[PDB]
Amino acid sequence: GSSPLLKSAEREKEMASMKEEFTRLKEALEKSEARRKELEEKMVSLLQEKNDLQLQVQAEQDNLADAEERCDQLIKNKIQLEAKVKEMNKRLEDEEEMNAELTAKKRKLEDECSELKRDIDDLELTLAK
Amino acid sequence: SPLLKSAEREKEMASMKEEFTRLKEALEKSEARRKELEEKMVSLLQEKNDLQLQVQAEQDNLADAEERCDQLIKNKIQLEAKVKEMNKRLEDEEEMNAELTAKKRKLEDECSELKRDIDDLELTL
Numbered sequence: 001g002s003s004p005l006l007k008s009a010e011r012e013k014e015m016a017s018m019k020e021e022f023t024r025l026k027e028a029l030e031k032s033e034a035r036r037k038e039l040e041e042k043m044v045s046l047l048q049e050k051n052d053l054q055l056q057v058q059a060e061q062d063n064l065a066d067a068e069e070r071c072d073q074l075i076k077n078k079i080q081l082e083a084k085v086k087e088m089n090k091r092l093e094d095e096e097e098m099n100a101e102l103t104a105k106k107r108k109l110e111d112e113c114s115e116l117k118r119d120i121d122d123l124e125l126t127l128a129k
Numbered sequence: 130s131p132l133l134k135s136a137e138r139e140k141e142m143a144s145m146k147e148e149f150t151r152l153k154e155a156l157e158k159s160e161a162r163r164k165e166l167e168e169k170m171v172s173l174l175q176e177k178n179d180l181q182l183q184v185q186a187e188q189d190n191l192a193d194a195e196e197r198c199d200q201l202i203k204n205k206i207q208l209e210a211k212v213k214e215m216n217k218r219l220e221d222e223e224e225m226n227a228e229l230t231a232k233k234r235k236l237e238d239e240c241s242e243l244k245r246d247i248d249d250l251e252l253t254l
Contacts, residue, residue: 015142025152032159039166046173053180060187067194074201081208088215095222102229109236116243
């Protein structure tokens with residue numbers, strides 16, 4: 001009678017309300033799944049972008065390693081060429097020293113010869129006739 | 130027709146009640162994934178930016194090194210020219226000492242003859 005009739009009215013209050021909540025849940029997930037997708041891709045393209053820089057990093061540290069190798073060779077080489085120079089600058093000073101010493105001996109024997117032509121001369125001009 | 134509509138109410142309200150727990154659960158997960166990419170994007174921004182800096186520092190090290198080479202190379206080439214110049218000079222200084230030696234010797238021998246012209250001639254007097 002009176003309850004079974006009232007229970008029918010409150011039942012339809014609860015369906016029209018459930019149809020509001022139905023449009024409401026549908027829309028919340030809809031707006032959040034736009035977001036979860038736009039974001040899943042945005043992570044993909046930043047995760048790849050990380051790895052273009054992580055390889056960029058390996059390419060530079062090994063570009064570097066090979067510079068440091070060429071430097072090591074060129075350093076070791078300079079050492080040796082610098083030693084050849086120092087040692088040739090010594091032999092040089094040594095030969096120029098010999099030059100100077102023979103020049104002095106050559107000059108001493110020129111003086112001596114000119115003096116002994118003078119003694120021969122002065123000796124023989126006692127016999128002169 | 131109104132005998133029916135009370136059954137057609139209950140089952141629109143059944144199949145809608147099941148779509149609730151389903152959408153409620155798809156909501157909680159869609160959000161959960163979101164929170165997880167935001168968590169992990171933050172962390173990636175802090176990697177990517179570190180690496181951008183790592184590269185700019187290694188390239189500045191590569192440039193230091195490439196410069197250190199270019200100058201060692203130039204310096205080795207200058208040192209090789211210096212070696213060549215000093216050998217050629219050595220040869221020249223040695224040539225000169227051999228000529229000064231032969232001159233030293235002809236004067237030694239010219240003086241030697243003169244000592245005997247004097248000595249041959251001094252005897253008599």
